[PDB]
């Protein structure tokens, strides 16, 4: 550990451009392993990682049925959201849901999540105690009253404590070689002159897993965290990640700067200089 | 492949209005229409529709199975593949059938219900259609017996997505896309899994209450005529209660705002002397 399992639901209406679409994706840590798209010939839960491909037919049947039920429920949920906010039936809207569990080293439940948004803004979310809800507005308060009357929180808690954790364990076991062994970043520093009086130092980290990493620039041992440029961590395409961090330096001061790289695939923190 | 759609409904009464839209290459672009009788003759003599095809007012001639092709100049044909088929059914041409629920319209979550459509008129087909924008009807072949033709539509497992106002239609041979007048509407309502309210006696007045924050309460006499509404009032003891002032057997349901076809599980039956 520690590890996480997450599911992401996207439900979207698109009047005139197609029937309502439901997309679900499953993640263990930073690795996607399942997907479901309602816009196919025959919608089925499909594998997206090699270590889940050898699960039996019962797994895929059950998951496909559950996803069909979910798709129907969230199409209806779009229809409901329309009434809640008194919106036109000709507009395109989106519900997003993410839920799952964080477990620790031994593999026991550390935290549970279940949050949902409407049109990109928070709608309603399960609290840390996994027995109560937090709503962002009046419509979500209606939903809260419903879910309290239906005792959805108890069921969700029962799922997060039970199936989510156990299946997370099974997944972590299935692809341990790829999921539980970190791959250190291959790293280097490049120099790019801006002018004759200043240049850019860029610190590169490539091919690392998992996605969490820290890249910092230091001048004489002090972080230049304000005048530093960070890019979003990006996927390489083969379940590994890339990132870099740049800083603008005066000509002849390259020696003063060092790039620091921390990643769980490294035994000791990394320090780099350009020459 | 273009996406063809009918708005607000493919099932449309005579004198009503329905618009066909053909969405292709991120546009509601110029397109041609085609029927199912022979698929490559464009209707209205090759008419290329500019924006969208508004049929208004709808006549029986508008009924049929449509497919559209969008314009695509930089291509061998210059036109796209045939789109998804959309069937426009016109209603109000025959006497209405009857629609009945077995065992009843109130269906508890997870269970099934039978919607029976029948008529004295020998309808060849029956169509079950739920009220709502962008909804497709189900079809069954009429079974002939004892002078009446009938059909049993199965609906389940009951979820909110299946709740709403249902109407059935009939179609006679040689006019498949021509439907009868709609049967009288049947409101299929889901009950549960929301917790049941308590129903007790406070001339007598029946009070039904709950810890849950229902927006209103429905009182119903078992074997009665109409249901009695009453808004839930947040009491001092934090309970939500409704007081129905008044022999027989009564039941109480809770319900929320902006949710017309779902109720809580019914309260225990209350015997009033």
């Amino acid at each position: 550990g520690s590890h996480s399992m997450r599911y992401f639901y996207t439900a979207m209406s698109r009047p005139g451009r197609g029937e309502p679409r439901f997309i679900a994706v499953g993640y263990v840590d930073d690795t996607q392993f399942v997907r479901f798209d309602s816009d196919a010939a025959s919608p089925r839960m499909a594998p997206r990682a090699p270590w889940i491909e050898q699960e039996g037919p019962e797994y895929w049947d059950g998951e496909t049925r559950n996803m069909k039920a979910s798709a129907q429920t969230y199409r209806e949920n779009l229809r409901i959201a329309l009434r809640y906010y008194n919106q036109s039936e000709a507009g395109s809207h989106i519900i997003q849901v993410m839920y799952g569990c964080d477990v620790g080293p031994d593999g026991r439940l550390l935290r549970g999540h279940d949050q949902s948004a409407y049109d990109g803004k928070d709608y309603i979310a399960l609290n840390e105690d996994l027995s109560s809800w937090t709503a962002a507005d009046t419509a979500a308060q209606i939903t809260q009253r419903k879910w309290e009357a239906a005792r959805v929180a108890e069921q969700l808690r029962a799922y997060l404590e039970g199936l989510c954790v156990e299946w997370l364990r099974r997944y972590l076991e299935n692809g341990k070689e790829t999921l539980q062994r970190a791959d250190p970043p291959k790293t280097h520093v490049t120099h790019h002159p801006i002018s004759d009086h200043e240049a850019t130092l860029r610190c590169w980290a490539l091919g690392f897993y998992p996605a969490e990493i820290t890249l910092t620039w230091q001048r004489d041992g002090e972080d230049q965290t304000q005048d530093t440029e960070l890019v979003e961590t990006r996927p390489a395409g083969d379940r590994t990640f890339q990132k870099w961090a740049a800083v603008v330096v005066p000509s002849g001061e390259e020696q003063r700067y060092t790039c620091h790289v921390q990643h769980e695939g490294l035994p000791k923190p990394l320090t780099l200089r350009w020459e | 492949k273009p996406f063809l759609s009918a708005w607000p409904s493919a099932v449309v009464p005579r004198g009503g209005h329905v618009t066909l839209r053909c969405h292709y290459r991120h546009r509601f672009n110029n397109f041609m229409l085609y029927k199912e009788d022979r698929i490559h003759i464009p209707i209205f003599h090759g008419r290329i529709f500019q924006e969208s095809f508004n049929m208004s007012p709808v006549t029986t001639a508008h009924a049929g199975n449509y497919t559209c092709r969008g314009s695509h100049p930089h291509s061998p044909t210059g036109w796209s593949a045939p789109s998804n088929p959309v069937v426009i059914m016109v209603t109000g041409n025959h006497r209405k059938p009857s629609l009945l629920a077995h065992p009843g319209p109130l269906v508890k979550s997870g269970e099934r219900v039978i919607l029976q459509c029948w008529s004295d008129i020998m309808f060849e087909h029956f169509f079950l259609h739920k009220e709502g924008i962008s909804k497709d009807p189900s079809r069954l072949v009429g079974q002939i017996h004892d002078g009446v033709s009938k059909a049993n539509f199965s609906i389940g497992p009951m979820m909110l997505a299946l709740a709403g106002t249902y109407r059935c239609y009939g179609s006679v041979t040689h006019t498949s896309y021509q439907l009868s007048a709609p049967s009288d509407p049947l409101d299929i309502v889901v009950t549960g899994p929301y917790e049941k309210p308590s129903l007790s006696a406070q001339s007598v007045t029946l009070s039904c209450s709950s810890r849950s924050s229902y927006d209103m309460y429905h009182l119903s006499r078992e074997g009665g005529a109409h249901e009695r509404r009453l808004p839930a009032v947040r009491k001092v003891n934090r309970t939500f209660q409704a007081d129905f002032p008044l022999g027989g057997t009564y039941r109480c349901f809770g319900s929320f705002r902006h949710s017309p076809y779902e109720l809580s599980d019914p309260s225990d039956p209350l015997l009033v002397s």
Binding site: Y7, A24, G26, E63, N66, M67, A69, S70, T73, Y74, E76, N77, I80, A81, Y84, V97, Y99, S116, T143, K146, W147, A150, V152, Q155, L156, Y159, L163, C164, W167 | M159, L160
Partner: peptide
């Protein structure tokens, strides 16, 4: 494994 819990708005 995804959640079997129905989330009706």
């Amino acid at each position: 494994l995804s959640s079997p819990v129905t989330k009706s708005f």
